[PDB]
Write an enzyme that holds these catalytic residues in place. Sequence first.
Site, PDB file in Angstrom:
ATOM      1  CG  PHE A 108      -2.033   0.915   0.589  1.00  0.00           C
ATOM      2  CD1 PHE A 108      -2.683   0.702  -0.322  1.00  0.00           C
ATOM      3  CD2 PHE A 108      -2.297   1.985   1.706  1.00  0.00           C
ATOM      4  CE1 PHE A 108      -4.071   1.596  -0.385  1.00  0.00           C
ATOM      5  CE2 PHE A 108      -3.169   3.106   1.591  1.00  0.00           C
ATOM      6  CZ  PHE A 108      -4.293   2.729   0.462  1.00  0.00           C
ATOM      7  CG  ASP A 114      -4.114   7.164   8.426  1.00  0.00           C
ATOM      8  OD1 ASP A 114      -3.636   6.593   7.754  1.00  0.00           O
ATOM      9  OD2 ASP A 114      -4.257   6.962   9.828  1.00  0.00           O
ATOM     10  CG  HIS A 156      -1.848   6.183   3.105  1.00  0.00           C
ATOM     11  ND1 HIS A 156      -0.901   5.182   3.084  1.00  0.00           N
ATOM     12  CD2 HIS A 156      -3.003   6.222   4.363  1.00  0.00           C
ATOM     13  CE1 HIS A 156      -1.470   4.516   4.089  1.00  0.00           C
ATOM     14  NE2 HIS A 156      -2.336   5.338   5.029  1.00  0.00           N
ATOM     15  CG  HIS A 197       1.519   5.454   7.585  1.00  0.00           C
ATOM     16  ND1 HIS A 197       0.857   7.238   7.527  1.00  0.00           N
ATOM     17  CD2 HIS A 197       0.653   4.651   7.672  1.00  0.00           C
ATOM     18  CE1 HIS A 197      -0.959   6.353   7.170  1.00  0.00           C
ATOM     19  NE2 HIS A 197      -0.682   5.808   7.883  1.00  0.00           N
TER      20      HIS A 197
HETATM   21  C1  VB1 Z   1      -6.568  -1.841   2.463  1.00  0.00           C
HETATM   22  C2  VB1 Z   1      -4.532  -1.539   2.880  1.00  0.00           C
HETATM   23  C3  VB1 Z   1      -3.976  -0.482   3.989  1.00  0.00           C
HETATM   24  N1  VB1 Z   1      -4.746   0.730   3.939  1.00  0.00           N
HETATM   25  C4  VB1 Z   1      -6.161   1.081   4.211  1.00  0.00           C
HETATM   26  O1  VB1 Z   1      -6.069   0.779   5.130  1.00  0.00           O
HETATM   27  C5  VB1 Z   1      -6.140   2.230   3.907  1.00  0.00           C
HETATM   28  C6  VB1 Z   1      -4.634   3.601   4.762  1.00  0.00           C
HETATM   29  S1  VB1 Z   1      -4.959   4.293   6.290  1.00  0.00           S
HETATM   30  N2  VB1 Z   1      -7.346   3.255   4.435  1.00  0.00           N
HETATM   31  C7  VB1 Z   1      -8.297   3.447   3.578  1.00  0.00           C
HETATM   32  O2  VB1 Z   1      -8.039   2.686   2.712  1.00  0.00           O
HETATM   33  C8  VB1 Z   1      -9.315   4.133   4.737  1.00  0.00           C
HETATM   34  C9  VB1 Z   1     -10.895   2.642   4.696  1.00  0.00           C
HETATM   35  C10 VB1 Z   1     -12.145   4.039   5.391  1.00  0.00           C
HETATM   36  C11 VB1 Z   1     -12.991   2.616   5.739  1.00  0.00           C
HETATM   37  N3  VB1 Z   1     -13.746   2.222   4.337  1.00  0.00           N
HETATM   38  C12 VB1 Z   1     -13.890   3.740   6.265  1.00  0.00           C
HETATM   39  O3  VB1 Z   1     -15.045   3.828   5.211  1.00  0.00           O
HETATM   40  O4  VB1 Z   1     -14.139   4.646   7.084  1.00  0.00           O
HETATM   41  C13 VB1 Z   1      -3.329  -0.901   5.257  1.00  0.00           C
HETATM   42  O5  VB1 Z   1      -2.197   0.246   5.490  1.00  0.00           O
HETATM   43  O6  VB1 Z   1      -3.086  -2.117   5.817  1.00  0.00           O
HETATM   44 FE   FE2 Z   2      -3.024   4.678   6.952  1.00  0.00          FE
END
Ligand code: VB1
Ligand code: FE2
Length: 329
Positions: free
Chosen positions: A209, A214, A212, A268
């Site tokens: 991933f 958060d 990004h 991160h």
């Molecule tokens: C999928 C990989 C994983 N990344 C993530 O989860 C990334 C970065 S923290 N964040 C998102 O995708 C937001 C998800 C939001 C959730 N569906 C919501 O509606 O509140 C990781 O960091 O392990």
């Molecule tokens: Fe994250």
Amino acid sequence: SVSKANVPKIDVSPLFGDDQAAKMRVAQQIDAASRDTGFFYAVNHGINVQRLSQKTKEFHMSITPEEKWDLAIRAYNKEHQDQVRAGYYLSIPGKKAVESFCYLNPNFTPDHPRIQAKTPTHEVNVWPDETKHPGFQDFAEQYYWDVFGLSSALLKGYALALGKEENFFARHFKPDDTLASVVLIRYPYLDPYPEAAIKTAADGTKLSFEWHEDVSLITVLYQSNVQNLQVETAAGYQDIEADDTGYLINCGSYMAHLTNNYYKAPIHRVKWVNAERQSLPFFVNLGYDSVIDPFDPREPNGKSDREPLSYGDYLQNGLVSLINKNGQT
Ligand SMILES: CC[C@H](NC(=O)[C@H](CS)NC(=O)CCC[C@H](N)C(=O)O)C(=O)O
Ligand SMILES: [Fe+2]
């Protein structure tokens, strides 16, 4: 070569109590971490994280392909147009390793006015059949409230750290309206692991991933004992050591905004590791209409020019922007 992040372990237990100076000493620690790499481990947090890991594994390893379609978000199942956030995020064998299940505030039911009004970012959770997954929903709902309680205390920490009264954030974090989410993420072991599911960073590191910030006020994260996370610093990316008994805490971009970047949202990314593991974040989101007035604790008069931002609109925008930048998860 790749150095290591200073990620202190902070005993957060005083934040649940009534010893105000002890709380301040915790707040100092949170301050220091937030100004350094932006991460810390919250320890002595009172959550049964071993049960969280067990119940989650049981769910991930028993849910069938049929049930995944039934619970799928609209990105994977056009029949589920109301499921933008909550539901199942499918893997794509050969292309996408990760899969997950996201749920929101259990108080979002058909009776809730934000559901009646069809307000973006609010949805009624979807669940597997109870008899097929006995205890799962109960577990997951109680987990939401358990980690909600930890997070409320951590928000007291952050408020005190910034010179405010301890409810400065927590007053906006309420069971009735919070947009907070839990995501139960599975990263699998795969042999052979498909290269299509691996991204290569500019610096050559293989990633699951990409970089990004958060979309959150703060993020409160449980992970399995497999090291994977790196934080960007001016000296490059640094490894964050795993600790499967602590919660990894960081600020999101809403905190950065409201503090004029005094508490940055650390950048991160997730290294590629061929190992079965769990990543179980709780994204601490406020209510749709919540607004925190920005301030700058570096200035004598504390004044910021930053615009106060409505949390719900920030969230909608951020979640969409993250999918566009880093791909549908
Ligand atoms: C999928 C990989 C994983 N990344 C993530 O989860 C990334 C970065 S923290 N964040 C998102 O995708 C937001 C998800 C939001 C959730 N569906 C919501 O509606 O509140 C990781 O960091 O392990
Ligand atoms: Fe994250």
